Amino acid sequence: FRKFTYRGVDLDQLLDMSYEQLMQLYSARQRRRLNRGLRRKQHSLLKRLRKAKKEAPPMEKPEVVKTHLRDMIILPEMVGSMVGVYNGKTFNQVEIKPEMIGHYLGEFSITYKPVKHGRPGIGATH
């Protein structure tokens, strides 16, 4: 019937243009930091991605990674690599589709441990 959609633009059409065009012509926001420019020499991160994908099982999603930096969007050939959830030092294995990768914050789970809470009073007043 239809085909995959991502903010109005199509999947093969994602893969059509270049990375720079993908970022300049993307939807609102997420481009300004690299519009000003994210510094070069990003080759080591790409090589870590290559190593993780090689270590990843075939016909399977790439394994958890220990990255703390907010991701970006490139051609859909590789966007979808699993990025773990920072709890305090771990990276939870949660199925994050490439539509949520590169968005706000890498913690796709809770950030804090809630405290046990009693009735109003006693534990609410001195």
Binding site: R7, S27, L105
Partner: protein, 69 residues
């Protein structure tokens, strides 16, 4: 009929761009189903929307104190 693509609330967004504003909640349902998607994907902003905690910059010091559960 000469109304610009800046004065209206269905401009291009996630999934596919929305077009045509129809009567009643013809797109309000469309703009609540994206909220449903946000809750169904288990996102921090989405789960905070589900829990009843406003996200656009709202602090919480007295909200949720009258008629809370």
């Amino acid at each position: 009929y000469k109304i610009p693509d800046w004065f209206l609330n269905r401009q291009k967004d996630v999934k596919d761009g929305k077009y045509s504003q129809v009567l009643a909640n013809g797109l309000d349902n469309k703009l609540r189903e994206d909220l449903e998607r946000l809750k169904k994907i288990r996102a921090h902003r989405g789960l905070r929307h589900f829990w009843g905690l406003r996200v656009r910059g709202q602090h919480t010091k007295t909200t949720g104190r009258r008629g809370r559960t």
